[PDB]
Amino acid sequence: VARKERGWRTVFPSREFWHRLRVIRTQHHVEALVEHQNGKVVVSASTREWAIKKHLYSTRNVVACESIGRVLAQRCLEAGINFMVYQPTPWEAASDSMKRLQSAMTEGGVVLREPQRIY
Amino acid sequence: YKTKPTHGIGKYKHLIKAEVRAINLGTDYEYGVLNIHLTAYDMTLAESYAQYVHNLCNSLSIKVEESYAMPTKTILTTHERVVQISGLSATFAEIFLEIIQSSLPEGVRLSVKEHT
Amino acid sequence: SPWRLLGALCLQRPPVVSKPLTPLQEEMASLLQQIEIERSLYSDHELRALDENQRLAKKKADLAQDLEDMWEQKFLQFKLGARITEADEKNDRTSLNRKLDRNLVLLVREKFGDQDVWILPQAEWQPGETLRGTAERTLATLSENNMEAKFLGNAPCGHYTFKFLGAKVFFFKALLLTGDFSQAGNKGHHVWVTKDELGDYLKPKYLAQVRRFVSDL
Amino acid sequence: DSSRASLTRVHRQAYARLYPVLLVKQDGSTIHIRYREPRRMLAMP
Amino acid sequence: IPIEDFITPLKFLDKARERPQVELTFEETERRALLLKKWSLYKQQERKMERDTIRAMLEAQQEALEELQLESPKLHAEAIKRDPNLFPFEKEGPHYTPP
Amino acid sequence: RYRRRAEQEAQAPHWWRTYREYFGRTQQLLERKQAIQELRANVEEERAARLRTASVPLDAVRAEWERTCGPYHKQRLAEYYGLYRDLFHGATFVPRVPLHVAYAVGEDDLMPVYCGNEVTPTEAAQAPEVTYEAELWTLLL
RNA sequence: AGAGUGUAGCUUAAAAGCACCCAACUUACACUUAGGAGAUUCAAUUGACGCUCUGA
């Protein structure tokens, strides 16, 4: 029922969500955020984190994205968040580690599309 | 708005130059446009060495105008590539040329000839 | 102050022979060879050697080896020039062919009245003499030859200033195009140094730091 | 450093086989040149 | 005149049938990964060495023009000056066999 | 890159009117380098890494997460669900103890109570199983 | 001999972010995708191993 911020049509990305998944790929670390509209980070999963950094070989590859999607999806089911709006750029969309990331999420248990607001 | 302190916060055309001789004035001395021909009987040495010269110039922040190639000559074929360069400092002429001198792979000759 | 006006010249030899490959460069070299083979597109020499023995096999069922053996025996005729004319000498430091793959530096013994120093060749200049003309004068002064060298710019490369009375020593840079180095048996002591003898011959910090503008590669 | 941009590969797609043929121009200067039908030693008169 | 030789040969179309067998094993691809990784290390350390030559020699020539600038005021005005002789500049590469 | 600098300038405190105004050790690094060097040393694990088929076990990541940086993510979630503005009038704290509470669902399994879950009152009919690793304590709901 | 001292290239980062390299699309460059390498100089805020400068 709550208001999705409907506007912002000229400016990428959309604000019309309640939860945005945002993958931050740096030079050294694959990072994954789950945020509100307000910029409050709700649930994150980063490879700058000793519980997951030591099980991994390299902190940036398709393995780290598949694992950060497994771990992030498992963290978001237990946080009671089933619905995100992930919006990529069209080069980030066709990348194999973000298809592997989205498959890790939707096979994890998290639907990457929110239901509509009821008016 | 004009009468507000936030006037001109959105202007951007002063951030873009949306639009040749040699400049040796009194202290700030620099060459004009340059040309570097590369002639070899291998496509790989001319193209790849042109890549290496071009990445050296991008790593030295040089205004590289064009990086095209010339047609060949049936003699076998003599392969040529042209790399244009504008902007060199006084030390930067010697330090820049000495690495192209000390980086020729196998039997490829140079040119520091100029335009037209 | 009385400045003892000194310029010099750090002569460079362009290497005529390319360096041999690293074994890592050998393995990556053959790897690039194989990936070039696996992505090529039907050379006619294969079409004249594979399909021709197919059709000649059909003729016997009812030559490129000559060509390759001619090419290989012509490859066995002409011997190669040595990349090392260096180890047979091992002592011809005065020879311009002392090393071929590296860059070689003119470097001559001198004996002052108060000093006795192995020296990168210097020049006593005049304010009427240009520093570029000081180096071009340094080309044909001590060697007494008909070398053909090349300069890039009026910029220097290494400055070392020792005093006793002031002085300053300027180290410029040239490049040998060719050279008619007549009478290689001079009375001087020119020794061509790649990199490593430059600390074996020049000890003080105004001379054991010439390598910081020598192209080490 | 004369082996940096020599460890190469033909980066096109319409290219046939190329062989490491040694060539001599006029003065006894053998250079590997990618050339067809493995001649091995070349010489221009 | 805009004429170049980047056009593909028209002969390179019909007989593209010599090599349909492109298959490798596990261990050759593993060693190939070691070659690409260690060769990326190799070229990386190469350009780190060349960056050390550019920075080292360039600081040597900048301090050269500063010592010449402070020890000769009328000779660093001409030290910046450029030669009329590098205009038809050439240099052939190295070879294998000297004459 | 413009997106990165652009988000950084978005979060910066500006002097004009903006959307936010209205809509607002050494032994550990030694064992870490030794264990990461001993981890990256295997050629089998490097082969599983380079073939994008390597896996990660989730349980050790979960418990080790509960030890290392669990309480700070749980502080994020309690800030997000408003437990600090409502349960202590804004005064924050850090949940240091990795608690466990789960409701006995029948006899076989038990619905876990993590930070932010959905549990029915059918599953919450009976008082739960409380297990935590500590040594006094008062529990509240 | 003394002074300034000291994170991988840089950081009023606190083991991070940019820089960096290879492979592919590119004539090439760039973008992007895939991969790679990296340091708190050693001992208890302090002393001595290394760099720079001021001298002989």
Task: Describe the structure using short key phrases.
part of a larger assembly; 6 chains; B: 116 residues; alpha+beta; 2 helices; 5 strands; elongated; D: 45 residues; mainly beta; Ribosomal Protein L25, Chain P; RNA-binding; ribosomal protein (chain A); structural constituent of ribosome (chain A); ribonucleoprotein (chain A); transport (chain A); Large ribosomal subunit protein uL18m (chain A)
Quick take:
With 217 residues, chain C is of the alpha+beta class. Chain C has helices at residues 23-37, 44-47, 50-61, 64-77, 131-139, 197-201, and strands at residues 3-8, 108-111, 116-119, 122-124, 146-151, 158-160, 166-171, 174-180.
CATH class of the domain at 1-19 and 103-217 in chain C: Alpha Beta
**Roughly how much helix do the residues of chain E carry, as a percent range?**
40-55%
* CATH-scheme architecture of chain E: Helix non-globular
Order of helices and strands of chain E: H
Biggest β-sheet of chain E, characterized? Answer: none
Strand content of chain C: 15-25%
Assembly category: part of a larger assembly
Strand fraction band of chain E? under 5%
N→C terminal distance of chain E:
39 Å
Note the run of SSEs of chain C as H and E.
EHHHHEEEHEEEEH
List the helices and strands and how they pair.
The structure is cut from a larger assembly and holds chains A (119 residues), B (116 residues), C (217 residues), D (45 residues), E (99 residues) and F (141 residues).
Chain A: E1 20-25, E2 30-35, E3 41-46, H1 50-53, H2 62-78, E4 85-86, H3 90-93, H4 96-106
Helix pairs in contact in A: 2-4
Chain D: E1 19-24, E2 31-35, E3 41-43
Parallel strand pairs in D: 1-3
Antiparallel strand pairs in D: 1-2
Chain E: H1 26-71
Chain E binds one RNA strand of 56 nucleotides through residues 4, 6, 33, 36-48, 51, 55.
Task: Describe this entry's structure for a reader.
This is part of a larger assembly, with chains A (119 residues), B (116 residues), C (217 residues), D (45 residues), E (99 residues) and F (141 residues). Chain A has 119 residues and is an alpha+beta fold. Helix content of chain A is 30%, strand content 17%. Chain A has a single domain, classed as Nucleotidyltransferase, domain 5, CATH 3.30.420.80. Chain A has four helices and four strands. In chain A, strand 2 and strand 3 form a beta hairpin. In chain A, helix 2 runs parallel beside helix 4. Helices cover 27% and strands 18% of the residues of chain C. Chain C has a domain of 134 residues: Nucleoside Triphosphate Pyrophosphohydrolase, CATH 3.90.79.10. Chain D has 45 residues and is mainly beta. Chain D is 0% helix and 31% strand. Chain D contains no helices and three strands. The chains are: A alpha+beta (119), B alpha+beta (116), C alpha+beta (217), D mainly beta (45), E mainly alpha (99), F mainly alpha (141). At the D-E interface, loops of D face helix 1 of E. Chain E binds one RNA strand of 56 nucleotides through helix 1. Chain E: It is found in: Mitochondrion.
